[model samples]
Target: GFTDYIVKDIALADFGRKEISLAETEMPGLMATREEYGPKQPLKGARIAGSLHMTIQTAVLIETLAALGADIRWVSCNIYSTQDHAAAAIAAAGIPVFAVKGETLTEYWDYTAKLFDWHGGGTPNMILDDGGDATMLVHAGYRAEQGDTAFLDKPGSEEEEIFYALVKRLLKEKPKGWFAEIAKNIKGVSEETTTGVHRLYEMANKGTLLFPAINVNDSVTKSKFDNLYGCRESLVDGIRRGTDVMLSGKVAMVAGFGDVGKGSAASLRQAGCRVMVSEVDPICALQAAMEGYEVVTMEDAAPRADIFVTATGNKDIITIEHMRAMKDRAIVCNIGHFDNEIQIASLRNLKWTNIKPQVDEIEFPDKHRIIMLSEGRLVNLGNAMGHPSFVMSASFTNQTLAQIELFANNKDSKYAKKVYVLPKTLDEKVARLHLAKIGVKLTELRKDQADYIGVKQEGPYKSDHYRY
Candidate 1:
């Protein structure tokens, strides 16, 4: 019988522990944080529920919170992102975790529910979320039971079918204010992806947000470096690992000129690929043009490019029409926060065959085929390890600090039921922590220089208008 925790193997716990040890050295920011705050036990008695990628690097984060005295429960936001060893190690260390690689949609929600089960007593007071799975379950399920059955309707695709299923289950179970119990107790949640932030903004706009949420996804240290440089290194690593395709001389179409797209475009260009960009935003299009990528519509780039990557968080950027126009054996993948960016659902009508664990070949009626990576999921995570730990150090550091701030707040606080940005000072602190890891010494600004730049000597570095 499987335990409360479902991992590939419990015996792999030793291997997971060793990998976490290796990552701890690379994650100086989070380690130093534990050393600095562990003594105070700032999170003592706090209950935190986390829904994020369960990888080796996240093991370090999980331990850091434990070191700070938090009682935590965890689940992976994605079905295929769990590293078996990582999950085994955490479970062996006595954390209640529910995750496994290649979990079914039903299992995904079941695990999510387990995180919030709180059979011991009180509800979780904080949530660390990625891609908004946990947040949606709480908020959407709450609304559904309150007579708002709109979330029950299929949202135009199979990608969202699982969410609707979860909501219906919540309604049937009648945990009867289960989410309300959580909302009443949770101090706040820290959201880590663009898609999650978008959901938070929607909840805030609808006046349905139940607690203060921090938009760590938009922090300068996070999106700029993590989304840009992190994706740059991981995207190429992922593609090569899966297909072993030579990138040189390939025509690559990057759909979206956001930070992730910018990184994908640059990485492909560096690999000697002829890069083209398709974007709906004019300023981003101009930036791509300035960066020497040909800015064209997806319609124009579909047939011309040999590899297609969707970096936009929006839905259906690449459709059956675009796939129909693609060259024989053309590759299509997504690095965006969600799988809906590529119309993987639309490909169900065609004849498809699996080539490998994460690679697929779909045949059109004309006998032309298109290769899909990771079933249109975040190829970087599904194909290879997600972001390198060094790059994630900055982003996860911000998440740790956000949790601390929210947990340590006094009974009187300014945080409301809306999305908030991490304080600029704390953002710079995260940057500084990673600087030593790369051996790059930051030059201090003189008082006069800071005055001239209209900034403080300690530094937020960039203004609100700065693009990066």
Candidate 2:
């Protein structure tokens, strides 16, 4: 019963096929990607192992991959990101999926362990990782069996052993997996977040990156659309879905002022909350200030905030001290990576006086009652359905095109071992596709206009940081 036993999880039975069909209606581009490119099977004969949030949008991606003739095996990168009905749909579609919703930490890794074992039966040609955990599992397993892994660390060769060692140490510390193996077995990868891209680039800069991973999250089409518009709605939906409480006039403090944080803060403010921004980045802090949010540090705002919602990926955004100081009936949660945002472990040690039914509150001594939503994990998936299809379309479409680009260009000898951005041209193409999908017309740069900006006539008119 360790790996092959029947999963008695009934989450899927509740998620009927009709619901999945309705969900897919929101992911037009993926369906479009299927219709336009399905016959070509660009990913034909490819076994794509994906570790991502298993929601309806992901289901759309899975279906798209299948239509494009790729064999798919998927697992949840986060313990709570899996949707039971979505899992059922994928399983019903005959895809070999290993994940269950609301799984314990042990169950999460157990499912991943099983998925890794299954992958060992026949290795996948490509890997799509979200949080890098599955890749870690595979690498650790590979090392255990093969002794020394064949992958090269960063700053390869005698030219830079020390640099390699440092980067290798950092990569090895990734809770999910070693990044080195990404360069070995994976022909390509499509990263979905800024944090992952930053890690990948570190590998690339040190010459440790051995594979070209498409940075979809950084694609113009992805972050701008999904991070802003999608997050706006999803953040609200996540909050409401979790607590079902009145948000009007609630003191909401959004941690970080990145795209996700901006969306969360703006949405909360518009919902009639007295919104504040907790930011460490000076530029972001100023931007939030200009946007009319009071900017403050966590230590300064923790006690007065009615809601301490972290959108920061950095650990310990809300420490035990902050939790202890939070006002009674205050809500604390996160919509970012890791469960360390609110330090739930710290909360566990505090005495829980009572747990009110239908209320997301956990009572502590000294008349302090903290409403912890989704255990300080990503509240969007843990408590509510993640971003809508409209938002997911750009992100997943970027993923789809990135996949196509990797299959076409990321071959041996083409690129150095490293995490790579989606080429500028491909990145723009993704933007155009999404813009077209949204029925938005772009202003073409005429030769005269191009010359006015001292840009080339052919393409790629902007510097690396041009405002898209």
lDDT of 2 by residue, 1-468 (tens): 123322335356456467768866777777778888887889887778788887777888888888988877888877666777777777766677777767766566655544533344645667777766655455444443344533444335652443234334444543434333433556777788766677777766865454667777776778887677777888777778767778997889999888889988988998889999988889999999999999998888888988878988788888888877889888888876656877777777665543432225666678688888776667776677677877787788788887776765555546545566676776666556555556787777788888898876656766778775
Runs of candidate 1 with Cα error greater than 4 angstroms are 1-8, 140-180, 299-303, 315-326, 340-353, 362-369
TM-score of each: 0.86, 0.79
In terms of lDDT, the poorest run of 10 residues in model 1 is 1-10
In order, what lDDT does every prediction score? 0.87, 0.71
Worst 10 residues of 2 by lDDT: 1-10
**Residue 399 in model 2: shift from native, Å?**
1.6
Candidate 1 has a TM-score of: 0.86
lDDT tens digits, residue span 1-468, model 1: 325577778898999999999999999999988988899999897799999889998889989999999999999998878998999999999888988989888898888987887746668989999989899888887787678887589576665887787778776775677767888998999999878999999999999999999999888888876889999989988889889999998999999988899999988898889999988889999999998999998999988899999998889899999999999999999998566988888888899899998899999999999999999989997788778888888888999988887887635777888899888888888887777767888888999999998888887778766764
Q: Please report how far candidate 1 places residue 112 from its true position, in Å.
A: 2.2
Best prediction by TM-score: 1
